Amino acid sequence: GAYKYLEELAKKKQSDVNLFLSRVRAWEYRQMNVIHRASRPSRPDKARRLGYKAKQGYVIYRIRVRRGQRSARCTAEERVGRYCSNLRVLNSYWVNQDATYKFFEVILVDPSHKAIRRDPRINWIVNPVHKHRESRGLTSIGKKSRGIGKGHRFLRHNTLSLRRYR
Amino acid sequence: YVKTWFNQPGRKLRRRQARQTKAAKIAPRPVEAIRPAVKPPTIRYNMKVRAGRGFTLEELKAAGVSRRVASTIGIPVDHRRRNRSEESLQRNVERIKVYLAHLIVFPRKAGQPKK
Amino acid sequence: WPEYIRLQRRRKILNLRLKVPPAIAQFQKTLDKNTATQVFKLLNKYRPETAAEKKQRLVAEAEAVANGKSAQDVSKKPYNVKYGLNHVVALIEAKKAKLVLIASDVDPIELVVFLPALCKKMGVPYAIVKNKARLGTVIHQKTAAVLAVTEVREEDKNELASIVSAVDANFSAKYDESRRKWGGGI
Amino acid sequence: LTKRQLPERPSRRKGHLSKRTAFVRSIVREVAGFAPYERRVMELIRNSQDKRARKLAKKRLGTLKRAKGKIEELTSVIQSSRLAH
Amino acid sequence: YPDYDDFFTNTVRETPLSSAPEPKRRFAPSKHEQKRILQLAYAIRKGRI
Amino acid sequence: LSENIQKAIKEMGFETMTEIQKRSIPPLLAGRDVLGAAKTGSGKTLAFLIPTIEMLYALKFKPRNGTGVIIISPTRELALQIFGVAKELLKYHHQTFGIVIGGANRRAEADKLVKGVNLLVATPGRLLDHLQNTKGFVFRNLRSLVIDEADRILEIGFEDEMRQIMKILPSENRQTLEQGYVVVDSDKRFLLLFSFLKRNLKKKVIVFMSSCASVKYMAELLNYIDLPVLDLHGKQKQQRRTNTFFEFCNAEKGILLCTNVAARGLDIPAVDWIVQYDPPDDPRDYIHRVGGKSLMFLAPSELGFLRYLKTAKVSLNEFEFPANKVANVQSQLEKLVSKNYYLQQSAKDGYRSYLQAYASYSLKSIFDINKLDLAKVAKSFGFAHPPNVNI
Amino acid sequence: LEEEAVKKAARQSNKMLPLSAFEHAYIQRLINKYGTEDFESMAKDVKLNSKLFNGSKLKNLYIRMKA
RNA sequence: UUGACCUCAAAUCAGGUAGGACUACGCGCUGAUAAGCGCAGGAAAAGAAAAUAACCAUGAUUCCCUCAGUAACGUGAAGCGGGAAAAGCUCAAAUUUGAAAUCUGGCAACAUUUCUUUUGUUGUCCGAGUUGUAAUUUCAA
RNA sequence: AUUGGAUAUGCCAUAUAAAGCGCUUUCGAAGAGUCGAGUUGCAGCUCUAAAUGGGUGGUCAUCUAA
């Protein structure tokens, strides 16, 4: 399909084509609001890979963040999640940057929509345990931030364990 | 900041109850599935044998149980462990082949459309 | 002026005042008026069946089966234009397509920016036509991105060999240096 | 003990390029062009400032393994552009 | 601002690219329709269509 | 011999052992190593595998006991002739028996060897990738590594492979064992044949191909384009193959389609026309097979064989025919190869092997795979864009 | 528990499949054109193998044809 | 003049949705663990290896005992072993191309209920969707 | 009275279908401003990859992240 070509093209981020669209879209993204809704994902492959199916209930937002100390991508998950109080966050990826702003998008899912609720691949997020996932550090970059992985890299002693018989 | 063990007689019984409530549903079939015999990996314990996680994909093929009909009849599978030597493989076929010899699966009614 | 219009004329002009790379430069030089009226005349026979009247022929197919008759034994292999971006990339890589049509207004331009390069490599004659919606009208859609003829019947093969020769001779034979130099900066 | 030869895991074949992926990269290598340091290197690999060329890739990429892979990457471009142009 | 280096796509590749063989479901009646017909045909016997 | 192998041999159509087989089957069944030196078509295929299949059967080996034997073959045309009899003999047996040749899927041929194939018919190149590169392919449970065509394997160019590869595998406690020309283009290769097969419809015609699959595809298209003919290979079934050669030789007029590998040793009758639609690979055997008329379509970029036969003191004449008389029916051959699912799968698996014969061409300077035209060699077969073949 | 697990699998043991009206006639049309043995060439039949069935699948129905 | 499409708006439009309280226990944020801020459930976090090991190898996660006050540098682990419980998997990336096979919604019938309060099926008309909704597959392949 | 998973049995089903495993002369796609290096308090800033590659451990072993 087209997503094979669109993954390898999205990696050559500094080349002439990927740089020309960077200057152009950073212009349009900057005159828009700080948080403004998309209608299509700018990167329709990265969004497709990170979970976004193109059906009703999947909402793409995009938000600039000031550079220069919580990780910027994490706050783009939180600030959009405080602007949409109903939508459930799935992911948030990088689409553009400049000398003063990083641009991201976010994949958001309506838990009340009776199209998410009838679909058994995304029905895990209707459950109430997933309320404000981006708050609890429970998502793609909130897991990497807090060192939740598998590896030697990444009160349990501070209490004395006084058994009955000792 | 302590860890007091006054519930220790109670977790024993709660585990005992919830191990009997597990058996209520599974009344004719065991409360836990058969685990293989795998040798511990250190120089210290490599002469011991103990239960592991599950039967490999070629311990199970060699015994006649496919990977799909495996977890129905209560046989754990380990898609990670591999049989490096025959002895690791011949010991665990005789875990399955005794288990299949001692197990009786109740049959079921099918859904063939008629007429 | 409203809050958004003064953007709507400025992103029109910043595509002009900047340096367009040669990959994107060819996406404004476009197939003309004339030769873009016969391509869609050939395609207007090979439209996909409208989803309402595919069902209409399916209830007329499923009523005779409920009595004993059939038509599957005598059903000849269908025809239509082939659309969708992911289905047409695989129709070019397999050298099955014979005329690829690229819209000139896909909003993220990376979606089709590899197609005039892929059509040049796989030897599939190509042309960039206007108005993605114009393709969308062909296949009963809102916005199409690309189309492709892979097989017309024996009726229009002689027409197709002529209309492609208009596509190379006007798009590919011309436009040969504007695709090889930067654009914009007007 | 009586050791077996095991077959290979089907996951150890990650890192092997197919013929379809290598055709994807070759197309997108040119249609995306060259970055605003990789234009600089192609000039220095053309007029043979080789020790100067390898000095920049190490400073920009970080590691010789990458700084050697580009050489091998970009030198294939010029030796194929002399037959195109 | 150089010209366009079409060092690779200059020529034409003559072969197809994907080598997996043509499946059999492109040479027979569309078996998705044949399932779809039987849903409509069944619906006539129940008298809903 | 065992009754299960004898009844299969009875079904195979072989009862009387060859004279060379009379001096070999007695010693080979007893385990005596024999330095085989026999002529082409002298029963070297059936006799050598007869005691080898029983030797593993006497061991009563299951599929997991490893590769208990090996039969080295020097050519892809010979390997399909070797594994074909192997697939016909051990049908009443239990273990696995397959082939490993050059120019195949090196991961769908290794995946066959991870389970454990008893009689793995091998090429001199792919077997060197088994013992060294592939992991999980155990050959250390073997009994005999049979070898064939010592004079041909040494001339293949891999004369250092047979000694290097044998240094790793198990050896101890195991025994070892006037011409007619038609200068045609790459495009109108079978176009002259399709015209000749229609013009000479009432004469004794024998058409030779360089691959078993080459006969297994053009014979189906001939019968689909209303031009029936008999094949001397069939579906690798020796029952009909024995009847086909009996019927074709008894027939005074007809078209005989056969591979040159199986044609060696068969009773070649007086054919009015003898055709080789593909180039020959054996330089000495094909010249000796001539001694009606015989003419083979010579390729445009393959005049080396004409320069080789002339250097071999053999006459050659180019009997011509006007190009306007050549039928331009290569448009319906692009529609038939597009519609039929089985004719295409033969025309894709026919051109796949018929290109590897140009890869394993013994005449390296004359027939070069990298010096021919890839485009026109498909429009003769019927495919517009030549199919995706792994080299 | 042995008895309940054998008599239940004694009446629920027969898995013969009678063909449909079409499935009977589809094989019926095929078998009257080439006979009852040469199933392997029916994957090369152009018209009556309109479903492009296997060489094996036709024998699967042929067992279901008789029994 | 007219018509699509993109973008942006407006509506006491149709139907929904978010705040706030408890905070013993959970997870984050900064922080002299305390305080402050944020966010859930009956548990939560964790989770089916980009893990250990150097063996005749182990095999998601959690928890207890031990390793052990040990290695390492007053602070202070982890592998192994012994227990409790054990359940696995789902997408992206290959063309359904002999047929968008997918789904929300409006209306109407048929049911159905912890329930006249609930939850669905079928018919039908837009609409979403080819910038990709289903079938297939997740490397154990 | 509401409710559980079952057992037998009645009616429906639509199966022109779907699934397990042999057998392969065929193919086998794998997540980036991420990894990584430099550098300030796992974050910030500068720079920016590859396909038997990449990661962590002793030429080997073991894993398959974004």
Swiss-Prot record, chain A:
Q: Which UniProt keywords apply?
A: Cytoplasm, Nucleus, Ribonucleoprotein, Ribosomal protein
One GO BP annotation here?
cytoplasmic translation
Q: Matching InterPro entries, A to Z?
A: Rbsml_eL15_core_dom_sf (IPR024794), Ribosomal_eL15 (IPR000439), Ribosomal_eL15_CS (IPR020925), Ribosomal_uL23/eL15/eS24_sf (IPR012678)
Q: Which PROSITE patterns match?
A: RIBOSOMAL_L15E (PS01194)
Instruction: Give a GO cellular-component term.
Output: preribosome
Recorded GO MF terms: RNA binding; structural constituent of ribosome
Coiled-coil ranges per UniProt = none
The domain of life for this entry's organism is Eukaryota
Q: What else is known?
A: There are 2 genes for eL15 in S.pombe.
Report the function annotation for this chain.
Component of the ribosome, a large ribonucleoprotein complex responsible for the synthesis of proteins in the cell. The small ribosomal subunit (SSU) binds messenger RNAs (mRNAs) and translates the encoded message by selecting cognate aminoacyl-transfer RNA (tRNA) molecules. The large subunit (LSU) contains the ribosomal catalytic site termed the peptidyl transferase center (PTC), which catalyzes the formation of peptide bonds, thereby polymerizing the amino acids delivered by tRNAs into a polypeptide chain.
Q: What is this protein called?
A: Large ribosomal subunit protein eL15A
Q: What's the source species for this entry?
A: Schizosaccharomyces pombe (strain 972 / ATCC 24843)
Swiss-Prot record, chain C:
User: Could you say which residues of the full protein are shown?
Assistant: 52 to 237 of 259
Q: Which family does the UniProt entry place this protein in?
A: Belongs to the eukaryotic ribosomal protein eL8 family.
The gene behind this protein is: rpl8
Q: One biological-process term from Gene Ontology?
A: maturation of LSU-rRNA
- Give the organism the record lists: Schizosaccharomyces pombe (strain 972 / ATCC 24843) (Fission yeast)
A GO cellular component term found in this entry reads: preribosome
Domain of life, per lineage: Eukaryota
Instruction: Name any one GO molecular function.
Output: structural constituent of ribosome
The name of this protein is Large ribosomal subunit protein eL8
* Keyword terms of this UniProt record: Cytoplasm, Phosphoprotein, Ribonucleoprotein, Ribosomal protein
Q: How does it assemble?
A: Component of the large ribosomal subunit (LSU). Mature yeast ribosomes consist of a small (40S) and a large (60S) subunit. The 40S small subunit contains 1 molecule of ribosomal RNA (18S rRNA) and at least 33 different proteins. The large 60S subunit contains 3 rRNA molecules (25S, 5.8S and 5S rRNA) and at least 46 different proteins.
From Swiss-Prot, chain D:
Q: Which PROSITE patterns match?
A: RIBOSOMAL_L36E
Q: Where in the cell is it found?
A: Cytoplasm
- One GO location term (cellular component): cytosol
Q: Which residues cross the membrane?
A: none
The record's keywords, sorted A to Z, are: Cytoplasm, Ribonucleoprotein, Ribosomal protein
MF GO annotations = structural constituent of ribosome
Q: Which residues form the signal peptide?
A: none
Q: Which Gene3D superfamilies match?
A: 60S ribosomal protein L36
Which miscellaneous remark does the UniProt record hold? There are 2 genes for eL36 in S.pombe.
Q: What does this protein do?
A: Component of the ribosome, a large ribonucleoprotein complex responsible for the synthesis of proteins in the cell. The small ribosomal subunit (SSU) binds messenger RNAs (mRNAs) and translates the encoded message by selecting cognate aminoacyl-transfer RNA (tRNA) molecules. The large subunit (LSU) contains the ribosomal catalytic site termed the peptidyl transferase center (PTC), which catalyzes the formation of peptide bonds, thereby polymerizing the amino acids delivered by tRNAs into a polypeptide chain.
Q: How does it assemble?
A: Component of the large ribosomal subunit (LSU). Mature yeast ribosomes consist of a small (40S) and a large (60S) subunit. The 40S small subunit contains 1 molecule of ribosomal RNA (18S rRNA) and at least 33 different proteins. The large 60S subunit contains 3 rRNA molecules (25S, 5.8S and 5S rRNA) and at least 46 different proteins.
Q: Which family does it belong to?
A: Belongs to the eukaryotic ribosomal protein eL36 family.
Name this polypeptide is given = Large ribosomal subunit protein eL36B
Q: Which organism is it from?
A: Schizosaccharomyces pombe (strain 972 / ATCC 24843)
**Lineage, uppermost ranks:** Eukaryota, Fungi, Dikarya, Ascomycota, Taphrinomycotina
Swiss-Prot record, chain E:
Where is this gene product found?
Answer: Nucleus, Nucleolus; Nucleus, Nucleoplasm
Question: What is the protein's species of origin?
Answer: Schizosaccharomyces pombe (strain 972 / ATCC 24843) (Fission yeast)
Q: Which family does it belong to?
A: Belongs to the WD repeat BOP1/ERB1 family.
Q: Quaternary structure per UniProt?
A: Component of the NOP7 complex, composed of erb1, ppp1/nop7 and ytm1/SPAC890.04c. The complex is held together by erb1, which interacts with ppp1/nop7 via its N-terminal domain and with ytm1/SPAC890.04c via a high-affinity interaction between the seven-bladed beta-propeller domains of the 2 proteins. The NOP7 complex associates with the 66S pre-ribosome.
This chain belongs to which protein, by name? Ribosome biogenesis protein erb1
Disulfide bond annotation, renumbered to this chain: none
**Which gene name belongs to this protein?**
erb1
**Protein task:** Component of the NOP7 complex, which is required for maturation of the 25S and 5.8S ribosomal RNAs and formation of the 60S ribosome.
